[PDB]
Design a protein around this ligand. Structure first.
Ligand SMILES: OC[C@H]1O[C@@H](OC[C@H]2O[C@@H](O)[C@H](O)[C@@H](O)[C@@H]2O)[C@H](O)[C@@H](O)[C@H]1O
Ligand SMILES: [Mg+2]
Ligand SMILES: [Mg+2]
Ligand SMILES: [Mg+2]
Ligand SMILES: [Mg+2]
Ligand SMILES: [Mg+2]
Ligand code: NA
Ligand code: NA
Ligand code: NA
Ligand code: NA
Ligand code: NA
Lengths: 1011, 204
């Protein structure tokens, strides 16, 4: 029948979907969510064999274990066990586009399990098996007999095994196809794997049973009264003595309870549902649920007889909240949300797409700790536990159907085709049936990147009918079609329009006000955090706070989808597209997260944390005004710590309790500060600290900070006049300068400082030279590739202009003696194919104090692409342990991504000065630096720098961090100016004009001395 | 202007004068200006200026130099934005080219006198025997900034001896979104803290 090549068959013999059940036979267990003996896990060791096509599977396997099989753990993705390769492709399908057919060589995983069933489960009642996730389609047999078939890799498939099992040992056989017609709907930008990758369980339910239950909470105008409504459905034989009791608990207190026999109200001319009942419970002053305070109640649904015998109980966590869009705003509990969201795929560097509770918790804790309050399930329903964690920890969730057909041409080819409406329908309806009681889900999404087709409009309306409690969004076809209640673009820019035909991406500020538009706008994906990125993040946050209808967005995305491989020595390394022989592949495009696959943060996470703070600050004099952006809570676990320091030297500090209502302000007056001793800049840093631990943070957690410059007393004192005067020696080849123990050598033929000595020790491995390029970031490269150059990408413009190849031509090199110093004057031209790209003119002035002051004035041809940087570089002979600086930090920061950094005195081990992006590039910059110390050297000025053991050349030539090797000595790059890194997207130039080095003429000055 | 330093060095083919000054008020240092003047065998005077402005002082209206020249010439010739008066936040209509007007056209006769007649983006300016080159903004007229500021009606201004030249490395925007609250946008305020500019002054 080849059911896997027919979108008209998405299942055979599958049971209806429904919310999470456990069939407790003890009501107190159901109240406290304790494990149920009626819900057994079949996870653990199973038998598995791999075949290249279903045609290759032997018939013997249905009744007997294959001796050749292996024992493996389930859940798992079989690529993670090495049976075949995972594939990383973004848009292009991994199989030929020829719906609904799939390749004849279709990797088939044959899983089986011998397991016991107790007679008690078989004497009465129903025993079903539940596969929470099987990718992408499968047939199931039990004790040799065929049971059924299922598709949709991201929702549970359940089958009644009652008539197939026997007491004692039984054997399941599951034939899992890698590719199926369901694959046409599963084109998300992620690794393509397969297998039984979510839990497998067995559930016993009584013959007369709760088959579904829906919980709703409705409120009066001020949220001081609610009615909880629970509709309960049964299967099995109706009897007058049956009853349903629904009770509501807040902790150990019972708040309300109601009982009724079955029999619903009249629905139409034929009557009502005799098999359902709706219980209505009044709740006065309910504790409301939000991500700020995830207050939860427990609803316990009991099916029992009138005389009091329990038949079974089901239950769920209930969060009293209302979600609605009114007057163009998305309101939660009547207040307008500001979504500090992130998209999160289910990805583990060792386990592939298998999720575990520890990693889920780790993700939620890091998210909350970093000021996120929302998560989008990009782009499919998640493992069930995720919703329970978001309900209890408090995160708003966008639950999204497993429908993505990005690779079709045009993108809506399937979604506008009615023959695909049935398969799409089940992806949406079965998700709502499973997840509609979770308070954390506040919005449903119809899928991702599948154009806009009439199937979407039919499904949008279905959801609006069945569950009016949550808005429906969908971005396909232009982000603002009739299938979305929220304008939800991906990567629309703040101020810049991108007027693509048919599906323009307007500036978000402009989009809100197009003629006739009134909806809220929340970007489904924004700020592409691939590599060294997040440049321009702050511009989004300023716009979200200024415009009521810009209600935030979901960053793209949480975690890099890198996978671990092992080298010949057994050591692990992070791999990306193409590293498994997979081809075609989209290389490093699978790594776009704020955190590395192991959950270590990239530096961009701190920028997101700062911009997403819940407290805003203003300073006027000695007065700090603190404004709360919380909607519901008062600042009852917060104090403000303030510190004033002079050039990094601490002068005074204090603490003040914060007591700010939601949306309110607090005025704090700082105490007078005695005028500082010395000259310099006074800086004020304030932090909000949480003194007590929470379920998601440790005592002492810092949730928000900001700095301001206070008074500055410019230095007007003349220095202690030199005890000596340096000596110049002129030679045909060099100009040398001597001062005590120091010596500087300037090469007359190159025009550069080629060597320095302290005592008898040489200080340089490569001369000090101008540098106008950077090892390109993922954002500089975009989609450009050797075989398919994108001439618009910054890297290609620089390359084509000759920036990477240009040679310094010496124009002048002279030496003069002054009363107290020696002055070397140079001028160089960088040219390419006859064109002068840049001119650098400098003076180096070495005085009796031993200081070398370097003044640099650069001219950049107006018609050459703006350069990546304007600075100097050198390879120092020394390798020292620490890096100490007065400037922005402590983490890597770039011009367009430096708001989270603070100006202070920082000191880190050298290796913290290198950011190990998987795909190596320029990294580790620190901006706004006035002093840098390393080994015996000190440089002073107003510059940006990086320092590490890897040269720019090595970073640009290396594609994987594991291949980098420390070079001799230490490469120092000191920039007067550095271009932004961009990040609105990683496929088109995204560095805003204000961060491009277009001024034409640049000046900077450095002083290099000893310390 | 308190003098912090004033030195002279003789070089290979030039004389180098270095100066440093601090402007203070009531004990507060507002601005520091560090300069070098390099006069060579060609007769050109290269001036380099590096100014520091206290972060806590209100951003200044301009960062430049001024002097009253003895010369009074009929024309003003420049390579830069024009021909009309233009300021940083009001120069889109001006075009870069070589302009040449009579001196009086370099003054705008606002009824209530004020700073006026600036031209920005100028790379070369000629007046009588003098030529200044660099990348600056300037105005030039027979009226001192002092006179303009003290005189409330244009008809009461009187031409001073000579010609007042204001050559700026940087000049604050003029604003205008309204005339009753500060309206110069941040990007046109001189808040960078450190400013660099260079000019060459020569004859003919
Ligand atoms: O992380 C990759 C990112 O790619 C986005 O698509 C990028 C760009 O690729 C082209 O092949 C498409 O035709 C073009 O329309 C698209 O914008 C995708 O939107 C994101 O979801 C993400 O996969
Ligand atoms: Mg099928
Ligand atoms: Mg028990
Ligand atoms: Mg048996
Ligand atoms: Mg896609
Ligand atoms: Mg490729
Ligand atoms: Na807003
Ligand atoms: Na991607
Ligand atoms: Na508090
Ligand atoms: Na690289
Ligand atoms: Na006046």
């Amino acid at each position: 029948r080849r059911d896997w090549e027919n979108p008209g068959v998405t299942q055979l013999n599958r049971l209806a979907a429904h919310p999470p059940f456990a069939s407790w036979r003890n009501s107190e267990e159901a109240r406290t969510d304790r494990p149920s003996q009626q819900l057994r896990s079949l996870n653990g060791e199973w038998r598995f064999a791999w075949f290249p096509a279903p045609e290759a599977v032997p018939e013997s396997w249905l009744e007997c274990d294959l001796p050749e099989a292996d024992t493996v753990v389930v859940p798992s993705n079989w690529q993670m066990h090495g049976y075949d390769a995972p594939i990383y492709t973004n848009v292009t399908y991994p199989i030929t586009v020829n719906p609904p057919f799939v390749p004849t060589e279709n990797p088939t995983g044959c899983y089986s399990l011998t397991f016991n069933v107790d007679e008690s489960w078989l004497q009465e009642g129903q025993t079903r098996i539940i596969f929470d996730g099987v990718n992408s389609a499968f047939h199931l047999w039990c004790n040799g007999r065929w049971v059924g078939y299922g598709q949709d890799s991201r929702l549970p498939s359940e089958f009644d095994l009652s008539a197939f099992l026997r007491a004692g040992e039984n054997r399941l056989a599951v034939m899992v196809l890698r590719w199926s017609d369901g694959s046409y709907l599963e084109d998300q930008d992620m690794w393509r794997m397969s297998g039984i990758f979510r839990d497998v369980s067995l559930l016993h339910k009584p013959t007369t049973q709760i088959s579904d239950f829906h919980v709703a909470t409705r409120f009066n105008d001020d949220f001081s009264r609610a009615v909880l409504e629970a509709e309960v459905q049964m299967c099995g034989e109706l009897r007058d003595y049956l009853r349903v009791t629904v009770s509501l608990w807040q902790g150990e207190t019972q708040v309300a309870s109601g009982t009724a026999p079955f029999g619903g109200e009249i629905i139409d001319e034929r009557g009502g549902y005799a098999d359902r009942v709706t219980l209505r419970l009044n709740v006065e002053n309910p504790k409301l649920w939000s991500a700020e305070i995830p207050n939860l109640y427990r609803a316990v649904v009991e099916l029992h007889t009138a005389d009091g015998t329990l038949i079974e109980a089901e239950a769920c966590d209930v969060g009293f909240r209302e979600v609605r869009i009114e007057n163009g705003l998305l309101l939660l509990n009547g207040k307008p949300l500001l979504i500090r969201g992130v998209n999160r795929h289910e990805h583990h560097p060792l386990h592939g797409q298998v999720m575990d509770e520890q990693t889920m918790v780790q993700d939620i804790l890091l998210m909350k700790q970093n000021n996120f309050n929302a998560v989008r399930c990009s782009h499919y329903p998640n493992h069930p536990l995720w919703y329970t964690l978001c309900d209890r920890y408090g995160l708003y969730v966008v639950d999204e159907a497993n429908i993505e057909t990005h690779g079709m041409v045009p993108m809506n080819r399937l979604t506008d085709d009615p023959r695909w409406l049935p398969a799409m329908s089940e992806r949406v309806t079965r998700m709502v049936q499973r997840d509609r009681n979770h308070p954390s889900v506040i919005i449903w999404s119809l899928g991702n990147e599948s154009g806009h087709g009439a199937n979407h409009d039919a499904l949008y309306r279905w959801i609006k009918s069945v569950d009016p409690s949550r808005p429906v969004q969908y971005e396909g076809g232009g982000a603002d079609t009739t299938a979305t209640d929220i304008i939800c673009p991906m990567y629309a820019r703040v101020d810049e329009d991108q007027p693509f035909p048919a599906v323009p991406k307007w500036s978000i500020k402009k989009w809100l006000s197009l003629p006739g538009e009134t909806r809220p706008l929340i970007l489904c994906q924004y700020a592409h955090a691939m590599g060294n990125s997040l440049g321009g993040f702050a511009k989004y946050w300023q716009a979200f706070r200024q415009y009521p209808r810009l209600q935030g967005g979901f960053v793209w995305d949480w975690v890099d989808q890198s996978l671990i491989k092992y080298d010949e020595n057994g050591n692990p390394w992070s791999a990306y597209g193409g590293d498994f022989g997979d081809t075609p592949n989209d290389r490093q495009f699978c790594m776009n997260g704020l955190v590395f696959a192991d959950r270590t943060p990239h530096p961009a996470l701190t920028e997101a944390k700062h911009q997403q703070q819940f407290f805003q600050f203003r300073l006027s004099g000695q007065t700090i005004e603190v404004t709360s952006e919380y909607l519901f809570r008062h600042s009852d676990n917060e104090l403000l710590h303030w510190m004033v320091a002079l050039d990094g030297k601490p002068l005074a500090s204090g603490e003040v309790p914060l007591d700010v209502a939601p949306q309110g302000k607090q005025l704090i007056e700082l105490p007078e500060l005695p005028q500082p001793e010395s000259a310099g800049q006074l800086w004020l840093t304030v932090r909000v600290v949480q003194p007590n631990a929470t379920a998601w943070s440790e005592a002492g957690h810092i949730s928000a900070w900001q700095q301001w410059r206070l008074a500055e007393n410019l230095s007007v004192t003349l220095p202690a006049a030199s005890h000596a005067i340096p000596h110049l020696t002129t030679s045909e080849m060099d100009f040398c300068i001597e001062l005590g123990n120091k010596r500087w050598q300037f090469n007359r033929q190159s025009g550069f400082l080629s060597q320095m000595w302290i005592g008898d020790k040489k200080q340089l491995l490569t001369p000090l030279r101008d540098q106008f390029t950077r090892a390109p970031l993922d954002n500089d490269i975009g989609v450009s590739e050797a075989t398919r150059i994108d001439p618009n990408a910054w890297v290609e413009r620089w390359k084509a202009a000759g920036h990477y190849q240009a040679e310094a031509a010496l124009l002048q090199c002279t030496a003069d003696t002054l009363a107290d110093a020696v002055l070397i004057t140079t001028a160089h031209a960088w040219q390419h194919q006859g064109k002068t790209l840049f001119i650098s003119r400098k003076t180096y002035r070495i005085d009796g104090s031993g200081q070398m002051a370097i003044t640099v004035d650069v001219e950049v041809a107006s018609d050459t692409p703006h350069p990546a940087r304007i600075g100097l570089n050198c390879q120092l002979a020394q390798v020292a342990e620490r890096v100490n600086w007065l400037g922005l930090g402590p983490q890597e920061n770039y011009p367009d991504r430096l708001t989270a950094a603070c100006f202070d005195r920082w000191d880190l081990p050298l290796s913290d000065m290198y950011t190990p992006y998987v795909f190596p590039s320029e990294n580790g910059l620190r901006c706004g630096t006035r002093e840098l110390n390393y080994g015996p050297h000190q440089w002073r000025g107003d510059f940006q720098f990086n320092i590490s053991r890897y040269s720019q050349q090595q970073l640009m030539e290396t594609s994987h961090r594991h291949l980098l090797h420390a070079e001799e000595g230490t490469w120092l790059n000191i920039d007067g100016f550095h271009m932004g890194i961009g990040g609105d997207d990683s496929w088109s130039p995204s560095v805003s004009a204000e961060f491009q080095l277009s001024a034409g003429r640049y000046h900077y000055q450095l002083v290099w001395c000893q310390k």
